[PDB]
Structures are given as C-alpha cells and as structure tokens.
Amino acid sequence: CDFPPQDVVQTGYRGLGMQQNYNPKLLQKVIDATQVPDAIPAATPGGALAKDVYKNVQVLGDLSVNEFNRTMVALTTWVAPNEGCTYCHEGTNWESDGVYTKIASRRMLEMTRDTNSNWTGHVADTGVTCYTCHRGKPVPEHVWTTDPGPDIPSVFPSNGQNTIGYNVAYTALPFDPFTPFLLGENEIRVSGNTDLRNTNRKSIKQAEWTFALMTHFSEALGVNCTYCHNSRAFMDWNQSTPKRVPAWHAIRNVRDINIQYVEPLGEVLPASRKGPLGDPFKVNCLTCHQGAYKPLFGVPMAKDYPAL
Amino acid sequence: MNAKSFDGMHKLWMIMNPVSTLWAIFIFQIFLGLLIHMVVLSSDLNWHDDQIPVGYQLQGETLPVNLEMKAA
Amino acid sequence: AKSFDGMHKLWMIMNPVSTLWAIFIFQIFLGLLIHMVVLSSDLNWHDDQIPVGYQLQGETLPVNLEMKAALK
Amino acid sequence: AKSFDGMHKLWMIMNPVSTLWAIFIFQIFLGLLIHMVVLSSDLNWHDDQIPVGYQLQGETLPVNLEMKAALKD
Amino acid sequence: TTGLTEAESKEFHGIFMASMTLWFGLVVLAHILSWLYRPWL
Amino acid sequence: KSTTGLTEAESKEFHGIFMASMTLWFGLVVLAHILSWLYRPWL
Amino acid sequence: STTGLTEAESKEFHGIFMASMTLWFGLVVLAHILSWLYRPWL
Amino acid sequence: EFGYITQYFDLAQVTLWAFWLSLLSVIFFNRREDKREGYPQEAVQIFGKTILTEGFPFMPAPKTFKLPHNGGDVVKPGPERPQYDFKLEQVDRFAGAAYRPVGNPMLAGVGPGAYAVRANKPDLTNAGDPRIVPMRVAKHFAVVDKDPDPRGMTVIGADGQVGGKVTEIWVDRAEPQVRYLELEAGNKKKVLVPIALCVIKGQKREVKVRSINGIHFNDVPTLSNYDQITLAEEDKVSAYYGAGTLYATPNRAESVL
Amino acid sequence: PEYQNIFNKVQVREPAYPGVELPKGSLPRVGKPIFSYWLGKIGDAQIGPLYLGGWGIASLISGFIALEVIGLNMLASVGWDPRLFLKEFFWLGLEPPPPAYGLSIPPLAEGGWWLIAGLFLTMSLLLWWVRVYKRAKDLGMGTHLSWAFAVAILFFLTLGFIRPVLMGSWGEAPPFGIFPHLDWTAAISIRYGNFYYNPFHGLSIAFMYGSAVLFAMHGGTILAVSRYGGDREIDQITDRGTAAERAMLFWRWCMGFNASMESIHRWAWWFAVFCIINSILGIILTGTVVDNWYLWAVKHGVAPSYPSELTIDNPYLT
C-alpha cells in the first residue's frame, strides 16, 4: 500500500491521462542515495606536458602535469576510495601494467571520452564521469549478463518467458530483452505505416519482446509510458513528447558502450566478473539512471575535468 | 498371531463397494500410465529422440537424391 | 500401560468405510507429492546421467557421426 | 490443584467425532506447511549437496567426459 | 448437548488425554534428533 | 448421539485387522528406505 | 435464559473457563520470556 | 510515410454496415413479440372516445400454447376475461390524471390491491397432482432442524397488535420450499400469508408482517377447499396483502417529505 | 425493514427427486443424491444425480488428457518442484510454437505439446456440444441452449485455430496460463494499433455492458414481485397474473415501453449472443484485412485530433 497523498506532474494536454505520479515516501529513498561528490580545487596552469615527463601515458598525454595529478586524485575518489591508489598499480611503480585494473581503467577512460564528446544527442552538456556508475565502488551496482533461465529438464529448450522476471518489472514477459536489443541490434518497431494489410510480417511474440524492453525503460527512469508516448498511437512520432528523441539516441549509445568497450574486456577481467555463460557484466539504462529521470537529478559534474 | 492376523480379510467387500472400487482402480491406472510415460519422456532416458539405433531426419537429409537436388 | 484399553471402541463413533477411503486417497496423493518433491532436487535420479548419458550416447554413435560429417 | 476437575464434561457440549476430524485434518495441513516452510530456507536438506552433490557427480563421470570430448571435434 | 452421559464423557476424556500425551512425546523426540543433526538457533 | 451401528464385537474385529494391515504397510516402508539409504544417502 | 443454561451450569462453565484462560496466558508469558532471552526485539 | 492511403473502401466497412442492418432487425422482431400481452392498447381521443391502436410495429399473428394434462389451448394475442367491478373517481379532468378509490380502500381491488382473473384450477405437478399443498397432505416433508419451525409462533401485525397464530405450513412439491403460512385469526378463520412478506424471529418466536395491521387479519380472503389452492385464490390473497402497503394507515399514501 | 427474499429462512426436505422419465433405451443415472445446507440457504440443496452416456464420456476423456498435458508442462517449467509450482503459479504457462515453424508440426518440447493440448480441448468441446443438444432434445424441449453454445465454441476456435491458420503460424495463438494469456491480450492490441479503434470491439463492449444492465434489471424486477408469485415464470407466461402485470407496468411507466414475461428472455438471449458474434468478427479481420486500427479509424473520420503546439523530429528521416 502507498497511502495518500501523492505528488502528480502534468505532462500533456488536459483530459488525456499523460502525467507522472510520485509517492513522497518512496522518492525519499532515491533522494537519500544520490550524494553528489565534493569538488576538487582547479589546478595551477601551465608547465610541462604529461607526454614529455611520464613514461607510459597512452591516453592522457596532452594534459599538463598538474592536470594529470588532479585527474588521478579524482579517479581514486570516484572508483576506489577505500583501497586507495594501489588499487590500480603496484606499490609505487606507477609505470607498470602488472594489474588488470590498469588495462580496464585505460579502456574505461577511452569509453568515457567517447560518450562525452560524440553522444551529446543523449547526454547533452551534462556528460558522465566514473561516479555516474561506480558511485565509489569498484563494481557497479546495476549490471546484467545473458540470462540462462530457470532449471528445467535437459531435453527442454528455453523459450525465455513465463517466469517471474525480475528485470522486466515482475511480469510474465520475456525475461532477457537486453541480449537482442542492447548488445545485438534488432528492430524495435512493430507497427505498420498504412491501415490495410501490407508487407509487414512482424508477429505478436516480437511485440512481446518490445513490450519487455519498454518496461525496463520505464523502471530505470521512474516514469510511465506517457513520459514519451500517447498510448492511443505508440508508433506516431507526431503524437510523442520531446523526451522520446533523447531515448532514441540513448539506445544507440548503450550499444556502442557494450560492443566497442565493455564486452572486449572479457579477456582481461577475472572469472569473478562474469556470468553463467561466461560473458562480463554489461550496461543498462539502470546503470546510470538508477531510478531517476536524470542520473543524480542532472548536476553537471563532468565540465570541471578536461581529461573526460 | 502373526499368521492368523489376516483371517477375516475377505469380509472387506461387505463394507467396500466392489463396483466403485473396480472403476476407481481402472481409471487411476490409466491416468498413472500416461503420467509416468510423460515424465520419463521428458528426461535423459527419452527413447524416441535419442537417435538410437539411428537418426532418421539426418538419414533423410543425406540421401543422394536430396543432396543432388540441394546442390542446385 | 492400561491407558489404551478401550481404543477398539473408536469404530463405534467413527465410520470405518469413510476412514478407509480417506486413508487410501491421502496415501496416493502423498506418494505422488513426495516423489515429485524429491525428483526436483539434487537427488533427481532420472536426469542425472548416471550410469550413463543416453542422449550424448546417441549423438556419438559412429553411424550418426559419419552422416553428420558428410552433411558438413 | 482443584481448578480442572470438571474438565471431562467438555464432551457433553462438544461433539467428539467432529472434534476428532478437525484435529486430524488440521495436523496434516500443519505438517505439510512446516515441511514446506523449512524446505524454502537455508535449512533445506534435499538440495544442500551434503553429503555429496549427485548432479555434479554425474557430470564428471569419465564416460560422460569422454563422450563430451568426442563431440568438440 | 451431545447425547453423551457423564460416564461416556469420562471414558472419552481418558483415552483422548493418553493419545495426546503420546503424540507430544513423539514430537519432542523428533525435535531432539533434529537439533542434534542441524541446530537452527 | 452420533453412532456407526457397529457393536463392540464388530469394532474389535475391525480393529484387529486394521492394526495388522497398518503394521505390514509400515514394515514395507522401512524396507524401501533402507534400500534408498544404501543407494543414495541424503543426510 | 436465552441459551438454556441455568445459573448453576453458568457458574460451572465460568469456573473452568477462567482457569483455562489463566493457564493459557501463563504459557504465553513463558514463551515471551524465552524469546526475549534469545533475541531481544526492543 | 506513416499515414498513406491506398483505397477508401474496404471489407471492415461493409461488414460494419451488415451488422448495423442485422441489429435494427432483431429489434423489429423482439418488439413484435413484446405485444402478445396487453394489446391492442386503448388511446383516448380529444373528447373522451377510446380506440384501439396497435403501435409500431404492428401486433403479430396469434400462436398457441398447448397446456399439459388436457389443460386447454391458450391463444396469444387472443381474447381476455372480463374485469371484475372496480370503482374509481378521476381527480382532475384530463386523460392523464390519477384516480381515487370510492369505498373502503382495503376492500376495493384497485391500486396495489388489484389482481388478475386467472383459471379456477390448481397448478399441477408433472404427475398431475396439485402443486401447493399443506404439510399434512404432503406426508413426506419435514422442516430441517437448524431452522425455526414457525408452527406455533404469533403474527404481530405492523402496529404491534396480534393477528393470530400459525397452524400449518404450505409447501411446493415441484420445487421443495415453503410458499405460505396458514394462521388462525382473531375471529377464528383460517387465512394464508405469503412467506415473502414475513420476517420470522426464532427467539422472540414471532412473525412480523409489516404490510397490514393486527385487526386487518380478519378480512383476508378465504379458500374453498383447504387441501389445495387455485390460481385465482393465490392472486386474491396476495393482492389483499399488497393493498395494505398503501392503504393500511391513512398516512401511508401521503408524500414522505 | 421488510423481508428482501435473498436467503431462505426455513428449509424443508423430502426424498430426492430422480428426474423426469427418459425415453426407453436409455442408460440409468449415476450417483446417489446428497443435500447441502449451505447451498440450500441460497438455492436448491440437492446435488446429483448425473447422466453419463456415450458423448459425455468421450468428452471427459479428451478434456482430462488435455488437462494432464497442460499441468505437466507447467510443472516441468519449474523443474518438477511442487513448492515452486504453488509459489509462482500465476506466471506459469504452456507456450505456442515459435512463429518461424509456420503451420508444420513442431517437435514436442518446442510447441508440440501446445498443439496436442489444443487438439484434445477442441474435441472435448465438440463432444460436449452433442451431449447438450441430445440432453435437451430427449426431454422434448427446444434446443435453444445449443445455439448459444455453438456461438461460444466458434469464438474459442476463431482465436486459436482459424485466425492462426489464415495468418500462417500457430505462434499467433494464446498460451495456457493466467498472466501469460493476459500478456497475449495486451500484445495483440499493441501490435495491430489499439483495439479501442476496432469498431466490432466497441460493439461487443456495448453488448457486455448491456448484459450486466439487463440482468440487474430482470433479477431486480422478479425479486420485487416475488410476493405476488412472480418467480414462477412458466405460469405467469401461460396464465398472466398480477405479478406479470405489475412487472410490465413498472417499466412502461418508467421508460415508456415494456416487454412481456416471455419476451424479456429473447432480449436476454440476443444480448448475450451479439457480444460474441462481434467478438468473432473483430478478431477475424485483425491482421488478415486490417493492419493498424488507428489508421483505419483516421481514414474513416473517427479519431479526435488534439492541438499540437510543438514539432518532433523523426530521427529516421534525418
């Protein structure tokens, strides 16, 4: 039970539905978990470059040395604050690659720069840092792997549904829509462009897989269908909200993160960071929103750091 | 006793109806037969699809006539 | 020790036929239930591939292997 | 010490056969329920793989291993 | 009323109490064995 | 008063055979469990 | 009397009812003392 | 192109028209079956003349029910039996005005106390026996204990007074259930009351009949033979109890607020 | 207040009624009738006896084979555990074949069991149809209950056999679950553009609302004149009494027209059958003739048009 009163935000014409509903007691749990990190004082300008002073820099070579050290202080406070600087080095041999965390970290720096520069159709001028997903822990909280399903007899193949389904909002819908959509690249659209029978050959099962993915979009942001659609025509772009256009880019963005960066790391990481089928943990909508309409309610952290 | 303990057993059918019992036994046995066959067919002991003594779909796919037709 | 002397009088207040039918039906239901509960655990004996896996045995018969080679 | 003397008169107002049937049925239902409640906890004794795991024992028999090897080719 | 006299009630009560005591004895024994095998508190 | 029509002699007879049958059934159950313990011990 | 019990029968029933209820509440108190010793909740 | 159109006429459209025409046509047939009772209706004209009109659509052609056990044929729409002799005075001089009873309202047969003129034969079972009978003629019935046996109770009558005492129960053999209670009244006549107008209190051992008053139980219509009841008599009895819902107290027909 | 006639205050028993005599050559009725006090508080107390002949045994063999199949597959989907079966019961189901198999017969654990259960359930319902027809006709009554049953069977076969065949896939049919079949309902509305703009769907909703209205009205009216013997409808039909007269005056005065004691039952019949006729017509055209019900409604001048104020850019056009 969620006892009244509630908070309602209108987001459309009057008498059409189209509004978002909040319970003040549940929203307090999301407010009580954000915790924007504290600023790091800007670095003294000018000096020698990192490429001319350090021995093994392959990404951040065009920062001054002050900017470099500042970036490293930030990487410690964002990812691994408990274990300290030796989480990704040996003792004080900074230039060694003897740990896998340094390879992982280098690849992650590249991925964050790519998202911050090339995907502004989705993260527009707020960008991301490490803290957007690690939130001060080495392993992020909300990730996914390819779901094998419940245990069934050995001669029975999986259909991929009719269970509880914890990632698709507790429905009996297909329980793993991320493999075909957020790592593979399948068509999400199912409806026709004319009113009578034409060349469209999609089925009700494909419609169910789409419905599953949309359920996850709703849960990961704290909203309903009507945050981006008018239900009377889920396929018309002239009857959608403006928020449908960033989500369209978000999809593509997530595929990039998983195809170019995170899945190829399956060689470097240990067996601890993999699932039943032997693939690493991957990124969702929930990996950075974590139940809010913008990660951390949209505080712009990434502008203060020229390394990202 | 231990030997005369089951003497009056034949009197059972003076309190249990023979017709109801017969029908119940027959129906229960048929239901149980279907159930056990279905449970064993859904395991590793399955005997229709195990491809022993030979696989027949595979045998049909590799007949020379079918191979020559697929080659074009 | 003589506390259970009049126990045989139980059948002067409880119907023997009803009791018999209830016992039989309950025993059959419990038999089915316990077999299903133990088969769905680590003690499962139909699918455990002991003493051998039969589907795997059928996939590696020389005839089936030679047919799968000529297809591929 | 003398408070519970007339207790045997209980069966002059409560029917003995109805009470017996109620008790028996309730006891069977409770037996099933407690067994199911304990099986769904950390105390479960069918799936705990003690004293040994039998599915794991079947997956690593030499015959099954040798058959799974000759399929990777 | 149940139609039982007071003698019949006394008889029933005797056997009922004996049976209940025996049942509870068996329950206690089962729990002692379970505690020896898998202690839960 | 609730009654089944059985006299005391009929009740004695029924009780004799009922107890014999129940004892035999429990004997068979014990035998099944000894075999199962020998094959696949569960505790 | 709307239940058919006389006043003597009511007195008898009341005696045994009160004794039984007292014994039941005693057992409840004992269970709670044991639980407090094992796992205090306040 | 999202909303391109190829052709305006399709099958869904035609099928919808066909449905509009298939409805619109069962309405016609049902409305015609509705007029096998009570028609032709009586239209009052400009200065009082009455004519028979028939409505839209017109009345159907007569059909016949063949009743069992040589119970005759019933043609519908067919003739009617003649009304009895109700007296009424109109209140306002126009065709749509209401009427007032002329004499004693309880004994007038107008308003909620009107009844129909049915056959003077009892309703029958599938074997040919009378259907509603007292429990001494039907010797196989018994009241289930767990239920208050009304035989013996009194019949308080809506103003607190006593009407009489219950002496018999009248049952229905085709569907086993209670239909009437028979009671002896204040002047020692035997009268019936329908079971659907009685509130039975087992502990008070009373039957409350909210419809009529206590003294009104002396004038309930009586039966010819007390081993059966006919359709006409059922109507008379029930209608007398229904007249009291508006005529028992002079304040009952008088605008709550 | 006054007695409302909702519960039976006094009950009476006579020996059980075996039933109207059947034509010579019939089988006896099976069972000894028992009485229920709680069922007698609201209705008739007798349970049984029952008539089992040729068609009602073939039915009941088919139906139970189907039920065994459905139950066992739901149970195999949790690994045979009955505890998990009870725990997750509303989420389990037997699923149709993958749509790529078309109309062929697929292997048993990838849709063949669904096909078996569907076939056996079909045969069960057709044998039951024949039973219902013959039972009413052997007692000499009109066969009106068989016509309505035929309509219902036709709707079951339309969604399930006829539409999947006309589409070319068994994977277009519902599964056997509770939450699974609700998911099917929502998905087929989402795929074919909003069932609210299907006109046969609107008409069947009209007739389902109307069924509830009409049966509240009729149940009320007959309980309100049961003090004048109105619950005995056969006699009020073949010899109109005061109960029928009051019942028809009430509606005439209230809304201007009325039915008779026999005609209201024809209104009931039709209101229950048009609901399902429109159900069949609406499902049979979806997918096979119309691909988007909202675009159809726009082409035929039916859908409203909310004001816009903005412009959203379709990113597939950019």
Ligand code: BCL
């Ligand atoms: C870790 C948990 C332990 C365990 C801990 C316990 C505990 C603790 C108890 C049981 C009890 C029982 N356990 Mg155990 N039990 C375990 C695993 C099992 C398994 C299994 C498949 O693994 C089974 C089938 C059982 C079955 C049983 C029943 C024999 C008994 C419950 C009977 C009942 O419900 O009567 C209810 C029905 C009635 C009273 C109706 C009337 C029946 C009349 C009076 C006669 C019935 C005969 C009776 C069932 C058998 C007695 C025969 C011998 C004389 C002993 N347990 C595991 C190993 N089990 C209970 C018990 O032993 O009670 C004495 C009990 O207290």
Ligand code: BCL
């Ligand atoms: C790992 C688990 C073991 C296993 C461990 C056990 C244990 C432990 C027990 C059984 C028992 C049974 N097992 Mg086993 N069992 C296994 C696998 C199977 C398989 C299979 C398809 O794999 C089947 C079909 C069975 C079937 C059976 C039944 C014979 C028996 C259940 C009887 C019953 O419910 O009566 C209840 C119904 C009634 C009492 C109604 C009364 C009808 C009258 C009395 C006649 C009935 C005949 C009766 C079924 C059998 C008597 C046999 C004769 C002497 C030949 N088991 C596996 C290998 N099985 C039980 C048993 O042996 O009982 C002694 C038992 O205790």
Ligand code: BCL
């Ligand atoms: C941390 C919490 C504790 C716990 C804290 C408590 C507390 C506190 C209480 C109980 C009580 C009970 N607990 Mg505990 N209990 C725990 C775990 C368990 C477990 C288990 C599977 O883990 C079980 C099966 C039980 C079961 C029980 C029942 C014995 C008892 C409630 C009986 C009842 O409601 O009768 C209601 C039914 C009636 C009143 C009907 C009439 C009853 C007649 C007269 C006969 C019933 C006999 C009686 C129940 C048994 C006692 C008889 C004596 C042996 C002489 N508890 C855990 C360890 N439990 C209650 C209790 O002890 O009552 C005295 C109680 O107050």
Ligand code: BCL
């Ligand atoms: C998001 C979902 C969509 C929606 C999607 C659908 C779909 C899809 C359909 C409907 C259909 C209907 N919808 Mg809709 N519907 C929506 C919103 C609504 C709303 C509303 C208030 O919003 C209402 C009031 C309705 C109302 C209705 C009914 C008028 C109609 C169902 C007829 C019926 O009674 O079937 C119930 C009757 C049967 C199924 C007959 C079964 C008969 C046989 C004989 C059964 C015997 C079984 C046997 C004995 C037991 C078997 C054993 C077990 C299987 C194991 N819908 C929204 C827009 N709706 C149906 C329709 O008519 O389409 C035009 C339909 O197909």
Ligand SMILES: CC[C@H]1c2cc3[nH]c4c(c3C)C(=O)[C@H](C(=O)OC)c4c3nc(cc4[nH]c(cc(n2)[C@@H]1C)c(C(C)=O)c4C)[C@@H](C)[C@@H]3CCC(=O)OC/C=C(/C)CCC[C@H](C)CCC[C@H](C)CCCC(C)C
């Ligand atoms: C005109 C349309 C409406 C309608 C009409 C209708 N249905 C009918 C009839 C008629 C006129 C019958 O004469 C026929 C009948 O005999 O009922 C008494 C029937 C019937 N409609 C039934 C159910 C039914 N009708 C439904 C719908 C409708 N029926 C429409 C709304 C629904 C819905 C809306 O979902 C259901 C579930 C059955 C009670 C009965 C047909 C019985 C039958 O075919 O049984 C034989 C086959 C078997 C499967 C035997 C095996 C055991 C069964 C499982 C027992 C049945 C129990 C019951 C179905 C429980 C409900 C289960 C569900 C929760 C899954």
Ligand SMILES: CC(C)=CCC/C(C)=C\CC/C(C)=C/CC/C(C)=C\CC/C(C)=C/CC/C(C)=C/CC/C(C)=C/CC/C(C)=C/CC1=C(C)C(=O)c2ccccc2C1=O
């Ligand atoms: C509006 C206007 C311009 C007014 C000017 C006119 C003036 C000046 C005044 C007129 C006076 C007054 C007060 C008029 C009010 C009436 C008006 C204007 C409108 C109301 C009309 C109205 C609400 C009708 C709706 C009718 C509909 C759609 C009904 C739905 C249900 C339906 C289809 C029922 C058909 C089946 C029927 C007839 C059921 C009734 C019925 C039932 C239910 C039985 O059980 C029963 C049992 C035994 C015998 C008979 C019956 C029986 O007839």
Ligand SMILES: COC(C)(C)CCC/C(C)=C/C=C/C(C)=C/C=C/C(C)=C/C=C\C=C(C)\C=C\C=C(C)\C=C\C=C(/C)CCCC(C)(C)OC
């Ligand atoms: C554990 O349980 C046991 C085994 C002990 C038994 C217990 C049974 C239980 C608990 C069962 C539970 C059942 C439930 C919840 C069922 C839910 C059912 C629902 C809600 C179903 C809803 C819809 C399904 C529909 C409409 C299916 C329609 C299918 C059709 C019409 C099939 C047509 C197929 C045909 C005619 C066959 C053609 C095949 C062929 C051979 C011609 O193809 C070429």
Ligand code: HEM
């Ligand atoms: C404040 C403590 C830290 C210090 C003092 C520090 C110091 C340094 C130095 C001096 C270098 C350049 C050395 C060289 O390669 O020649 C370097 C590189 C690097 N450090 Fe750290 N570091 C710290 C914390 C971290 C942490 C927490 C991480 C892991 C999150 C990390 C990951 C890296 C990576 C990936 C590089 C390589 C950068 C590149 O390739 O361009 N460091 N560090």
Ligand code: HEM
């Ligand atoms: C597929 C899952 C995703 C969906 C559907 C999605 C959707 C959206 C939407 C709709 C917005 C605009 C919010 C608004 O204006 O109300 C948004 C903003 C944002 N998202 Fe995502 N997102 C997803 C994944 C991610 C991921 C993985 C990250 C982190 C890498 C991320 C970071 C951001 C940021 C930073 C913003 C705010 C940008 C701004 O201020 O305009 N999103 N997202």
Ligand SMILES: [Ca+2]
């Ligand atoms: Ca890229």
Ligand SMILES: [Ca+2]
């Ligand atoms: Ca084989």
Ligand SMILES: [Ca+2]
């Ligand atoms: Ca084995």
Ligand SMILES: [Ca+2]
């Ligand atoms: Ca174990």
Ligand SMILES: [Mg+2]
């Ligand atoms: Mg599904």
